[PDB]
Amino acid sequence: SYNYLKAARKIICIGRNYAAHIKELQPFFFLKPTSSIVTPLSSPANSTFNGLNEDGTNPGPIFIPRGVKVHHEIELALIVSKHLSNVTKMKPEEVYDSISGVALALDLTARNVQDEAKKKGLPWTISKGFDTFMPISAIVSREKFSSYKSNLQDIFRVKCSVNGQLRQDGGTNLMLHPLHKILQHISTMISLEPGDIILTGTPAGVGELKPGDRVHCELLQNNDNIVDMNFECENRPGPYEFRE
Amino acid sequence: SYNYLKAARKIICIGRNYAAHIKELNNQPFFFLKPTSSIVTPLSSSPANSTFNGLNEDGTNPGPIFIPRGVKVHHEIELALIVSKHLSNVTKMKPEEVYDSISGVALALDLTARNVQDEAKKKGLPWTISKGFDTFMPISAIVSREKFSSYKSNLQDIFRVKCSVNGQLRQDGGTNLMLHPLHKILQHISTMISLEPGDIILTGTPAGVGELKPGDRVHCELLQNNDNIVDMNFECENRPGPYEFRE
Ligand SMILES: [Ca+2]
Numbered sequence A: 001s002y003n004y005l006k007a008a009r010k011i012i013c014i015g016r017n018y019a020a021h022i023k024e025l026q027p028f029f030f031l032k033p034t035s036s037i038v039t040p041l042s043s044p045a046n047s048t049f050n051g052l053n054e055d056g057t058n059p060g061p062i063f064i065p066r067g068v069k070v071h072h073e074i075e076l077a078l079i080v081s082k083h084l085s086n087v088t089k090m091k092p093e094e095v096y097d098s099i100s101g102v103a104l105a106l107d108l109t110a111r112n113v114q115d116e117a118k119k120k121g122l123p124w125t126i127s128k129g130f131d132t133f134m135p136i137s138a139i140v141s142r143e144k145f146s147s148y149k150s151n152l153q154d155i156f157r158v159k160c161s162v163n164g165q166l167r168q169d170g171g172t173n174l175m176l177h178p179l180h181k182i183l184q185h186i187s188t189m190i191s192l193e194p195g196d197i198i199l200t201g202t203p204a205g206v207g208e209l210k211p212g213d214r215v216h217c218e219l220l221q222n223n224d225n226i227v228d229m230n231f232e233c234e235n236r237p238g239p240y241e242f243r244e
Numbered sequence B: 001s002y003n004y005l006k007a008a009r010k011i012i013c014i015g016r017n018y019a020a021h022i023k024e025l026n027n028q029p030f031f032f033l034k035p036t037s038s039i040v041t042p043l044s045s046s047p048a049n050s051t052f053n054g055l056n057e058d059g060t061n062p063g064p065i066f067i068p069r070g071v072k073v074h075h076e077i078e079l080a081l082i083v084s085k086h087l088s089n090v091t092k093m094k095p096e097e098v099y100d101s102i103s104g105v106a107l108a109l110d111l112t113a114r115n116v117q118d119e120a121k122k123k124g125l126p127w128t129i130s131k132g133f134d135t136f137m138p139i140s141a142i143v144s145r146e147k148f149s150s151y152k153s154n155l156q157d158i159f160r161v162k163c164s165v166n167g168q169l170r171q172d173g174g175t176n177l178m179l180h181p182l183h184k185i186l187q188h189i190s191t192m193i194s195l196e197p198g199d200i201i202l203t204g205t206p207a208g209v210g211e212l213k214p215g216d217r218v219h220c221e222l223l224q225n226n227d228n229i230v231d232m233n234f235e236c237e238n239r240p241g242p243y244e245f246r247e
């Protein structure tokens, strides 16, 4: 089921949210356009995005734009199911009641474009929003993990492999800002509504992606595979070309 | 009609897009997104502690401009285009094609948390929050293209925008001062972030940016061939939540 993708009016993400070292066991956010959504192949002309299908699907490859160095970032996505506006405080048990399920997503980033944006203090939008820059899986309904209703913070494990090599493998228990604080903090600035997709950060191990690479990503629940997706990278057509 | 608002999948904006001195007129651009959750319409357009609870079947969201605690807000009056078709990897667009790529235009305010944005700039961090607070995109009803069907060969020079606060005029400029024209904006954007019917594109603001504080009265308008086609007003208030900016 990819239908939830049609109800997504917004995609807000959190950055640098995973511990790289034991000792560290403040936050910034950025948007991603829903036009960047792309779904696995097994789910017009010169077009790199023509809108989602009736069922919310958008099968296609990752379009690496010319001149751009793309880095992959595997992440757990929350599918908000309630209206959250200026929440003063949320407890772990409440995350479950605020979402309809989760999904496995890749927060593709145009590294060199972002490097230049950070240098000039300019918007990150483009480096984070190219078409297909948010490859995502089908939704995993909460009922599938209602048994962990009181706290979902430690049950998930996310991993990403490129060309048969494991590059990222982290558990959500390494998260710096927990799920309940993410939902609460955000609501005090940019109110959330049903259908909103929230990316919660990526674990260490970010690597690059080039045309021809095969990406295999997984989402585990108590070390049990519940999401397995694959994407192929190709050259983005059109006239775009990034040159510093 | 504010129904178009319900169909907007995204809001993209172009920055520093207006000449401030004659000199540049006889001759680079960056973009950023805004959440549709930042939309707010005039009080006469149509729960608890909520500064945004979704749009009505109307497409409206009548309300004040909620200014966050500790935040300094700057107003930016701008012309918004309402895309009507799929634009992806377009190689070239002529001024004449703008009319057929939109269903109309609207008058919008691109509100910004200046001190929050200054900090982001220094730290090289995203502008999202400084540009996305609820109500940070006050916007008018739609102006259907038939209204200006007569200039379908080139709409670049027929509009003018103006913003005034507490009775005093602050911003006033014609779209003829735009550094990057409407057809180029649409074209260039499509080569990175494809557009689909319903997308809203903010096209930049003229010089004269100023501040808005709780209790302020904002009056903005859009003219076509120097005739007022849209006139909207907004009230500023204190954001009612736990948020507070401190440097
Ligand atoms: Ca990320």
Ligand SMILES: [Ca+2]
Binding pocket: B013, B014, B015, B076, B078, B110, B202, B204, B205
């Ligand atoms: Ca602006």
